[PDB]
Structure 1
């Protein structure tokens, strides 16, 4: 059989159920999900890569097809207007024939402007869920992405079905295959660009195939949080390596990060090691009922406990915390839900210190320690400048920073660290 296919059946049933609750709560005849269209480059004839509407790939693993429409009410079989053009120019895939095809009443669409006769006769009562408000309005839809319907699905999107969890496991598997190849490459001393190419080859992913734009940084670039470029020339000296990169599976994202030392023995190599442990401990705290805010205060606690131990700051943890200086070394959140979207949706009425970690939710735990001169500077401009070992900073500054991020499934009974279980030390 197909473990995935057996899971899918329940996935559909879950979405169907949520579709019924919501159109009732808002008195709708049904919800229409538009996959989107391709965007044309200004004054050109080229297009940007296509990126499906999350709300559409939520139902099925069709992420590379524009002009597809889902119309459902939760009780009847959902309709799938599937775009399958015909023209010798582009290769034509066979009609939908995989396990999910059976769960929809599929109607083939050959021309994007022919969709109206395939849609409901009276559209006034169906909610349009998509980006092209103009096109919907032309077809007769009047309810444009109703906040109530959007927040509803978004709220439940935080609770991953079994098919979703399996999908995400697959995405993690592919992503580590590449996080290791990218590792080897760093140690072989290749450039950021070469390593990035290594990661793509190992994940069999094209650049536009991955969930977000990879961060492949070396030495001081590791401090650029949102580093996007890829130097083509390998640094003179290879010191530090930080790579934030994921992979995709049926529309679900993986979001892993790893920092490395080139040798594996100096101060920095030591710093990373602390972080790893800190990271794993923060990972170990996830449990239904916990408030993210607690793991937050604890991450910052551990940061300060690290800044004090490596004499980066000549104070104690409680004071680095208290005086409020841990944020200039760890300037971002500890984690975020993740699924169909890297920084996934959810939460009571459209990550907070108040939100509660619940079962079947997926998270990233990504604590970090960075030496970001811009942020480092503003610290020297306050009467805290005194309490810091600047000589120590410049001693590490050339390594940029550290980040370790895993993707963890939270079960009612336990934690499943997809990343580490796949053995990515």
Structure 2
């Protein structure tokens, strides 16, 4: 028996039920999900790597196949037009024969432009959920990504089926293996580039297989939030390491961050150790009914208590917050839902400090503390310039910043930190 296979049955039942409800509320005959197509590079005969329509992979783990269509109404067996071309050029895989194949009425498609005869005869009442409006209109569809249908599925995406939670445990498990290998590489003095290679090797992921662009930062780079590049030359001296990297499994993402001190001793190393405690205490505050806003406000508080205690700012926690200067050391949000998409969808009628945490949802808790040139300089142009220990700043500035991030499943009865349960210190 396959645990995933058993959970999948309920997954399908759940999407089926959700489908029945929405087509009735909108008087539709059904919904058609288009996996998408490969995008061709301008004036070239090369293509950008394929990225499946999230709304299509929500149903099954087929994420590397364009020209696939799902037609469903929630009561009848969902139809799956599965693109399987034949030609000596590409390797032809066997016909879908895994556990999920049984849940669909599968029609094979040998050429993309032969899909019209496999779709409903009258497409007018079928909502087209996909990126290719022009192709949909030519086929006869009229309802393009109707907002009410998008909002419905997105809202329910926040509530993960057991199959989804299982998939997400797997993604976290792969990512963790990578974060450890990346960790070891850092302590060996490797370059950002080399560290990235180790992560990919340990997770057996190709760059285009991870859920987002990995951030493998060293020293001052740790202060660059959207740091995309990988230096090929190792730094003369190794001070800090920040790696925000994830993994994929059946279309579900992991999104983990870890910051380290090269020596394990000193101010920065202590700062990290503190942030970790604050980070865990924040994870610990997740519970059904809890307002994300409280968690957020609390994070800024912890940050202020950190800035105060490390003499980075010569003021009391409450006054650091009061004066509103914590945002210069922690400029981003505390967390977000995650699942099929890294920054997952959801929320009443299209992360606000107003929504409540609920069971079966999955979150990331990622408090941070950075020393950003631009953001700091701005703080100097205010009457608060007199309140920070600029000597303490220049001493840490060389370490860039800190961020610790886990993915946690909020069960009705408890919290499951997939990341730390995998033993990622």
TM-score when normalising by structure 2: 1.00
Can you list the C-alpha shifts for 1:151-178, whole angstroms capped at 9, x where unaligned?
0000000000000000000000000000
Distance in 2 (CA, whole Å) between partners of 1:49 and 1:160 is 28
Q: Report the Cα offset of residue 320 of structure 1.
A: 0.2
Distance in 2 (CA, whole Å) between partners of 1:402 and 1:93 is 45
Q: Report the Cα offset of residue 21 of structure 1.
A: 0.1
Distance in 2 (CA, whole Å) between partners of 1:319 and 1:131 is 49
Q: Report the Cα offset of residue 52 of structure 1.
A: 0.1
Distance in 2 (CA, whole Å) between partners of 1:127 and 1:349 is 18
Distance in 2 (CA, whole Å) between partners of 1:50 and 1:336 is 25
Distance in 2 (CA, whole Å) between partners of 1:31 and 1:421 is 39
Which residue number in structure 1 is paired with residue 96 of structure 2?
96
Can you list the C-alpha shifts for 1:251-285, whole angstroms capped at 9, x where unaligned?
00000000000000110000000000000000000
Distance in 2 (CA, whole Å) between partners of 1:95 and 1:366 is 42
RMSD: 0.2
Distance in 2 (CA, whole Å) between partners of 1:140 and 1:128 is 10
Q: Report the Cα offset of residue 346 of structure 1.
A: 0.2
Q: Report the Cα offset of residue 41 of structure 1.
A: 0.1
Q: Report the Cα offset of residue 335 of structure 1.
A: 0.1
Distance in 1 (CA, whole Å) between partners of 2:289 and 2:125 is 39
Which residue number in structure 2 is paired with residue 80 of structure 1?
80
Can you list the C-alpha shifts for 1:98-126, whole angstroms capped at 9, x where unaligned?
00000000000000000000000000000
* Matched length: 425
Q: Report the Cα offset of residue 244 of structure 1.
A: 0.1
Can you list the C-alpha shifts for 1:337-365, whole angstroms capped at 9, x where unaligned?
00000000000001000000000000000
Q: Report the Cα offset of residue 134 of structure 1.
A: 0.0
Q: Report the Cα offset of residue 54 of structure 1.
A: 0.1
Q: Report the Cα offset of residue 180 of structure 1.
A: 0.1
Distance in 1 (CA, whole Å) between partners of 2:234 and 2:309 is 32
Q: Report the Cα offset of residue 380 of structure 1.
A: 0.1
Distance in 1 (CA, whole Å) between partners of 2:205 and 2:355 is 34
Can you list the C-alpha shifts for 1:63-106, whole angstroms capped at 9, x where unaligned?
00000000000000000000000010000010000000000000
Q: Report the Cα offset of residue 56 of structure 1.
A: 0.1
Distance in 1 (CA, whole Å) between partners of 2:296 and 2:43 is 48
Q: Report the Cα offset of residue 311 of structure 1.
A: 0.1
Distance in 2 (CA, whole Å) between partners of 1:207 and 1:408 is 25
What SS does the corresponding residue of 2:85 show, helix, strand or coil?
coil
Q: Report the Cα offset of residue 225 of structure 1.
A: 0.3
Q: Runs of 5+ in structure 2 lacking a partner?
A: none
Distance in 2 (CA, whole Å) between partners of 1:84 and 1:402 is 46
Q: Report the Cα offset of residue 131 of structure 1.
A: 0.1
Distance in 2 (CA, whole Å) between partners of 1:169 and 1:280 is 19
Which residue number in structure 1 is paired with residue 236 of structure 2?
236
Q: Report the Cα offset of residue 302 of structure 1.
A: 0.2
